[PDB]
Amino acid sequence: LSQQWEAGMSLLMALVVLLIVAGNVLVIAAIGSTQRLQTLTNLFITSLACADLVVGLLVVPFGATLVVRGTWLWGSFLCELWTSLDVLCVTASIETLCVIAIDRYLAITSPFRYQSLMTRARAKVIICTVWAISALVSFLPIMMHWWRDEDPQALKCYQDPGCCDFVTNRAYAIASSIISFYIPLLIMIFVALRVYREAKEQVMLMREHKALKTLGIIMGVFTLCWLPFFLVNIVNVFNRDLVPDWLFVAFNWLGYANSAMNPIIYCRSPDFRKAFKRL
Amino acid sequence: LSQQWEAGMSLLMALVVLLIVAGNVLVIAAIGSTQRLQTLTNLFITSLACADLVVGLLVVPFGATLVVRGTWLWGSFLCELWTSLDVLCVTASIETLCVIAIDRYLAITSPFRYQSLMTRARAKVIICTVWAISALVSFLPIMMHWWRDEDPQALKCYQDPGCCDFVTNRAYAIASSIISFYIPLLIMIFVALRVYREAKEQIVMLMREHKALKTLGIIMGVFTLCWLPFFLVNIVNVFNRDLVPDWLFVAFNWLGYANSAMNPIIYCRSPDFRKAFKRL
């Protein structure tokens, strides 16, 4: 029965890969190549389609090989690389997002200065800084093996090339989550809020609102996709065996789904669909 | 190294599957749902997008499992089913095609009667007959084990559920090919020819007719190039056994599988089609 699953869901995983590599890049295509979609707020969506893409390019395909065959064949050097990219795509996703939600308070209480401060020139650097931070924070602490837990259970998984199963020390399993998930989340939900308070206070701004709600969705779905997983890892610290280990995988995949989910939340803009058709 | 290939090209095979199941069905979509594409000559393309589709649906996915893992896990009952569908899609493809090329002599020396004889009502039955014949010929002789060769080499592959590797008796490896490949091919190439002779005689606007014609020519060209090298082999299978390496024997059945994913993308040539492809 096991070999029927081995070749059974490999095809399927490959299909979801196509959802990502296709969808995100058709998004990227209609973005970079159309003027009406080149509004700044879609440049953070340029970056994000990017992160989501590297997800469905480098992280998912290699990321099956552990589920399909049950183990890692790709060498532990690559093990490190793959894991740090699995996280990088994340800190890039959330952090870029939080940049969006921090921008759109400036499309509200500070609209007058939209083009003065935020320039299609000035946001590029900001995404770049998001990826110097994403890169620093994700990629340094993994290569530092700041994530090595002395215990032999994990010790054997650090020394055995065939386990890329991610097991970390007490406090990296704290720092990791605080920095790369929690504070930016609570901050961009916090910041989404005042924006959606000022949005109630309101010739035609409706376009503004149909384009706004669809941004709201992104962070909603994101939070629902990567919260259940980044909620777990805390219980990982508090009670170990209260947390079944198959779920530990089910949620990192549930989150992978975000990537393929994104381009299809962009089916909501006709600005976009018009460039999607002729595309 | 072997487990890196096992999971290495499984993804990829799945991707080509997507080429098929997607492409053929987007073809089918823009066909059935648009008037301008509902011309009879595209109803044979309805059927064909169909065969190609069942190919990229039932035959290819199961058809990997033998290449990926090296063997058949799906039971020999299913082994039979899968193989007979692997062939059925073929006899449907060629035979439907030959129907096309036999039609378009009637779009030439007999244009006057186009709507009198050929009716969007009358070609449906014809495709149907193509699939009573495809079904009879492909599906009977396999369930008859008319393909069992007594020899123990193959005997073990018939009794072992794990070998769906297709090995057949002397004369089924003759009948199979004559009927389901050769005569219909030589017949539809034969019939393509006189049509492309009458097509030269021309030189208000028939050019549309010609740009829509050449793109039909392509289909049978590519088809012949895809399934000829494979259905050329199986004859040398009869004449000289070890002169024919057995990895090629697979490489060509896949090269041919490619036809399916190749088809919808030869339909990128009609704007009638692309217009229904965009809004689609």
Side-chain angles (χ1 to χ4, degrees), chain A residues 187-242:
Chain A
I187 286 316
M188 75 142 184
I189 262 48
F190 170 92
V191 171
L193 280 213
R194 195 185 185 186
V195 156
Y196 291 99
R197 158 159 124 163
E198 215 97 78
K200 280 187 177 182
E201 120 179 274
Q202 61 156 18
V203 165
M204 292 287 189
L205 281 58
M206 218 59 60
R207 285 251 61 184
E208 172 112 310
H209 285 229
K210 193 80 174 178
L212 197 80
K213 190 177 183 181
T214 296
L215 267 180
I217 289 182
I218 299 310
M219 306 170 311
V221 40
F222 188 77
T223 302
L224 283 173
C225 284
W226 287 84
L227 190 61
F229 167 108
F230 275 101
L231 272 168
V232 160
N233 205 15
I234 275 308
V235 197
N236 164 257
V237 159
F238 279 50
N239 283 322
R240 290 198 298 268
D241 37 33
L242 265 72

Side-chain angles (χ1 to χ4, degrees), chain B residues 110-270:
Chain B
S110 301
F112 316 104
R113 188 121 108 104
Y114 209 93
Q115 208 73 25
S116 239
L117 175 69
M118 266 284 185
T119 325
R120 292 117 94 177
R122 296 201 171 185
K124 266 178 175 179
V125 84
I126 278 328
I127 314 190
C128 276
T129 278
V130 182
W131 293 67
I133 292 159
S134 295
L136 201 79
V137 164
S138 166
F139 261 101
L140 243 295
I142 280 197
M143 280 60 195
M144 227 57 180
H145 291 266
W146 268 35
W147 69 286
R148 51 87 208 295
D149 195 38
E150 283 293 56
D151 274 35
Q153 287 128 274
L155 203 75
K156 177 178 186 172
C157 178
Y158 301 168
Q159 288 166 347
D160 167 39
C163 189
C164 208
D165 206 334
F166 196 70
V167 46
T168 48
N169 40 77
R170 70 284 179 100
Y172 182 95
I174 295 171
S176 178
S177 311
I178 267 188
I179 282 139
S180 306
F181 188 104
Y182 264 93
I183 233 170
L185 156 68
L186 311 184
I187 285 316
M188 74 141 186
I189 261 47
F190 171 92
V191 171
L193 281 213
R194 195 185 185 186
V195 156
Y196 292 99
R197 158 157 124 165
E198 216 97 78
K200 279 187 177 182
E201 120 179 273
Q202 61 155 19
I203 33 180
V204 165
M205 292 287 189
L206 281 58
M207 218 59 60
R208 285 251 61 184
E209 172 112 309
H210 285 229
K211 193 80 174 178
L213 197 80
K214 190 177 183 181
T215 297
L216 267 180
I218 288 182
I219 299 310
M220 307 171 309
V222 40
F223 188 78
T224 302
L225 283 173
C226 285
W227 287 83
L228 189 61
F230 167 108
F231 275 103
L232 273 168
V233 160
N234 204 15
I235 276 308
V236 197
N237 164 257
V238 158
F239 279 50
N240 283 322
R241 290 197 298 268
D242 37 33
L243 265 72
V244 179
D246 194 86
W247 85 309
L248 240 52
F249 205 57
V250 182
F252 288 168
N253 221 334
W254 284 96
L255 192 174
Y257 283 130
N259 195 220
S260 229
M262 296 169 84
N263 271 12
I265 334 180
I266 310 192
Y267 295 111
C268 279
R269 282 183 148 78
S270 262

Side-chain angles (χ1 to χ4, degrees), chain A residues 158-204:
Chain A
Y158 300 168
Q159 288 166 347
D160 166 39
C163 190
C164 207
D165 207 334
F166 196 71
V167 47
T168 49
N169 40 78
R170 69 284 179 99
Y172 182 95
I174 296 169
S176 178
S177 311
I178 265 188
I179 282 138
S180 307
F181 189 102
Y182 264 92
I183 232 169
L185 156 68
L186 311 184
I187 286 316
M188 75 142 184
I189 262 48
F190 170 92
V191 171
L193 280 213
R194 195 185 185 186
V195 156
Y196 291 99
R197 158 159 124 163
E198 215 97 78
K200 280 187 177 182
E201 120 179 274
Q202 61 156 18
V203 165
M204 292 287 189

